[PDB]
Design a protein around this ligand. Structure first.
Ligand code: NA
Length: 330
């Protein structure tokens, strides 16, 4: 089997991407944030505290003929941005892009933090990291990918995120028309439960490539590119008037600037992030200070290749017995 679903930016900055997901019988379609940096599939629901729901579409298990309470199971998760959610668990039928899993754990939110309530466009998350990070207790649950895997034509999914445009998540096949050149595969460590890999270095603009190992994760649920402070300072030093602002919470730059590209290494291959991808616009409405898309990872404890980096590539998440990542230009 295979599945193919379009993923759409939630706003004009590509802050996140939503993908429609069918849950239950008859189908209830919710727009989920597919997150390769977490392992829970959780949704706004008929159980979510009413004051914490503001425009989201909810899952109502009582209206699904295939829903069953997973008795005694609870979940609670905290993300890198300080947001959180928690609740109870149902099993139900879940379909993505025509690929169906029966008996998927659907984690129903009783509580969500303010950042979730305030984002009316995101109805929940669908985690695609390794199932060792799933928060369900006392019986840990599998991701949608892990449950689908054995049915898939190939044990893979691909992320093809757009810049200011829709893109695609495919399950079970490589679309050889969706990229240019060849795919370069690189080793993955699953020790921390993430799609963790080592980039071979970077360049700023037309500058020379610096060969240096950068361990980090491929995370579709993170908007920005978080890298070591040395790398990030080297980038922003090429932008006149750029500075790190403790008041704003990262590097800002004059909105009048033209940003340089950023290149990262994948083995002997190179992925180029155009400068435009690194502009996240005014810090507040009407400001002439713009927020940068490359930020320091210092204090986060891991480097994160988030959407700024991933949307410059066709990315293969190879879930074979020995997992690997693949990157191609597009
Ligand atoms: Na922000």
């Amino acid at each position: 089997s295979t599945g193919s679903a379009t993923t759409t930016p939630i706003d004009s900055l590509d802050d996140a991407y939503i993908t429609p997901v069918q849950i239950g019988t008859p189908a209830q379609t919710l727009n989920l944030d597919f997150d390769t940096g977490s392992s829970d599939l959780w949704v706004f629901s008929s159980e979510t505290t009413a004051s914490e729901v503001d425009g989201q579409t909810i899952y109502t298990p009582s209206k699904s003929t295939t829903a069953k309470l997973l008795s005694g199971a609870t979940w609670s998760i905290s993300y890198g941005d300080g947001s959180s959610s928690s609740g109870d668990v149902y099993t139900d039928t879940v379909s993505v892009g025509g690929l169906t899993v029966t008996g998927q754990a659907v984690e129903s939110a009783k509580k969500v933090s303010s950042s979730f309530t305030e984002d009316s466009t995101i109805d929940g998350l669908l985690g695609l990291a390794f199932s060792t990070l799933n928060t369900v207790s006392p019986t840990q649950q599998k991701t949608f990918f892990d449950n689908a895997k054995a049915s898939l034509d190939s044990p893979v999914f691909t992320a093809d995120l757009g810049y200011h445009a829709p893109g695609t998540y495919n399950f079970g096949f490589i679309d050889t028309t969706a990229y240019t050149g060849s795919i370069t595969y690189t080793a993955v460590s699953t020790k921390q439960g993430f799609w963790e890999w080592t980039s071979t270095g970077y360049a700023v603009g037309s500058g020379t490539f610096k060969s240096t190992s950068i361990d980090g994760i491929a995370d579709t649920g993170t908007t920005l590119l978080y890298l070591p402070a040395t790398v990030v300072s080297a980038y922003w030093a090429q932008v006149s008037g750029a500075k790190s602002s403790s008041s704003v919470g990262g590097y800002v730059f004059p909105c009048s600037a033209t940003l340089p590209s950023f290149t990262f290494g994948v083995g002997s291959a190179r992925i180029v992030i155009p400068g435009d991808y690194i502009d996240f616009g005014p810090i507040s409405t009407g400001s002439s200070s713009c927020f940068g898309g490359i930020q320091s990872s210092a204090g986060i404890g891991i480097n994160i290749f988030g959407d700024v980096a991933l949307k410059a590539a066709f990315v293969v998440f190879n879930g074979a017995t020995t997992p690997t990542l693949g990157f191609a230009s597009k």
